């Protein structure tokens, strides 16, 4: 974690969500890491690249994952912008 | 013995040592 000599001293850096930006633990088994597969501009077919979004399990169990992934795809290449 | 019939027997008792201590003027 960037010590005095600046070398990486940690076990591992775990994930963090993008709905409430909390730190998903090693046992938070309600936390999805989901894939959204976009298509190219011309043929509507799976060109080969996608997107990844993590949702922490506490914000899942609360009730607004669908409110979340609408909004965290809203800015990010989606259908709407409306 | 109940709590209120612990009172009544020790209310009947304290109205006696208020009277026997008053006996010896």
């Amino acid at each position: 974690m960037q010590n005095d000599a600046g070398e990486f001293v940690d076990l591992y850096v775990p994930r963090k969500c993008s709905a409430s930006n909390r730190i998903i633990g090693a046992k938070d088994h309600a936390s999805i890491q989901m894939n959204v597969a976009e298509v190219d501009k011309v043929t509507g077919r799976f060109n080969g690249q996608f997107k990844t979004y993590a949702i922490c399990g506490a914000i899942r169990r609360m009730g607004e994952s669908d409110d979340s992934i609408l909004r965290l795809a809203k800015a990010d290449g989606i259908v709407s912008k409306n | 013995m109940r709590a209120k019939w612990r009172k009544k027997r020790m209310r009947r008792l304290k109205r006696k040592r208020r009277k026997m201590r008053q006996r010896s003027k």
Binding site: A19, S20, N21, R22, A58, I59, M62 | -
Partner: protein
């Protein structure tokens, strides 16, 4: 009957960030809570915030982020010296690395690390981490 409008301002932040929300609403302003929030803005725990200026003490909408844990207050505004500031750290900070208490000096509302560089003591105002 609102004794300490700072403490309500920070309690409104503390409950609404653990829900994970992006925005809050602080109802009465003061010139001691706008200078409070620009301390944790220049250290980047929160971000943009508006002063919704009405003619009385206006509202404040803070765009929260999600870098924050607890932003409490010290409700007695104690005095703290510079031989005293080291005991306030290891009572209520999570570490010696990060977090800040914030004490209002005679020279302006500053951190604890900014104050010991300027080498003035003042009254403690709150803490955030």
């Amino acid at each position: 009957v609102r004794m300490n409008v700072l403490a309500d301002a920070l309690k409104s932040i503390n409950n609404a960030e653990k829900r994970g929300k992006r925005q809050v609403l602080i109802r009465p302003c003061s010139k001691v809570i706008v200078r409070f929030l620009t301390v944790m803005m220049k250290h980047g725990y929160i971000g943009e915030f508006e002063i919704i200026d009405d003619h009385r003490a206006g509202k404040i909408v803070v765009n929260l982020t999600g870098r924050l844990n607890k932003c409490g207050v010290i409700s007695p505004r104690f005095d703290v010296q510079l031989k005293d500031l080291e005991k306030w750290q290891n009572n209520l900070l999570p570490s010696r690395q990060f977090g800040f208490i914030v004490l209002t000096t005679s020279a302006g509302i500053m951190d604890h690390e900014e104050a010991r560089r300027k080498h003035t003591g003042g009254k403690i105002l709150g803490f955030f981490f």
